[PDB]
Design an enzyme around this catalytic site. Sequence first.
Site, PDB file in Angstrom:
ATOM      1  N   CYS A 109       0.857  -1.166   0.000  1.00 17.25           N
ATOM      2  CA  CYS A 109       0.000   0.000   0.000  1.00 17.25           C
ATOM      3  C   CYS A 109       0.903   1.228   0.000  1.00 17.25           C
ATOM      4  CB  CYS A 109      -1.011  -0.012   1.135  1.00 17.25           C
ATOM      5  SG  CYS A 109      -0.262  -0.144   2.769  1.00 17.25           S
ATOM      6  N   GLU A 110       0.478   2.321   0.620  1.00 18.83           N
ATOM      7  CA  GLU A 110       1.306   3.521   0.618  1.00 18.83           C
ATOM      8  C   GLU A 110       2.491   3.427   1.577  1.00 18.83           C
ATOM      9  OE1 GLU A 110      -0.722   7.224   1.478  1.00 18.83           O
ATOM     10  OE2 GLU A 110       1.096   8.377   1.114  1.00 18.83           O
TER      11      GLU A 110
END
EC number: 3.1.3.48
Length: 171
Positions: free
Chosen positions: A94-95
């Site tokens: 993800c981020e």
Amino acid sequence: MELIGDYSKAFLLQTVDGKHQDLKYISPETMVALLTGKFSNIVDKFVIVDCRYPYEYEGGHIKTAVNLPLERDAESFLLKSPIAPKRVILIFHCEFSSERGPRMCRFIRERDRAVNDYPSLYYPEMYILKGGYKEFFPQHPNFCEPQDYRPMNHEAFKDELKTFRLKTRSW
Ligand SMILES: [Cl-]
């Protein structure tokens, strides 16, 4: 170290410590080793699953990554017609060190167990990219497309975040 999901062999990649003790994490260098073919004689195919929202992915993602933020789309892409081989490996991210990547990793394992006779699995070897896109991009920008980074909380994308959250299975 334990064997992979179907207990057929050891995990291939060197791992690093991450938030979730139950999951296997890899570094940006290991991700680059896969992308550069260091494991090509053993790994037939690997899929980088970018669990971020479409606007984040569009603003800069790892080359060849597939954007599958919704559980139903990740399930359809990976398990409707399984990617068969040598090893197949999935890498979720993800981020940063949030929960979108880890949640998807656990969900895919749950579905993989559900469609198989124990302990067989279509994806026995899965990892999480430690630090996500936020830590990958500053290390290897030329392995990203486009060469930029758009955070989830980007000021100009507040409505896009909201629009996409309303398409998820649960909040
Ligand atoms: Cl979802």
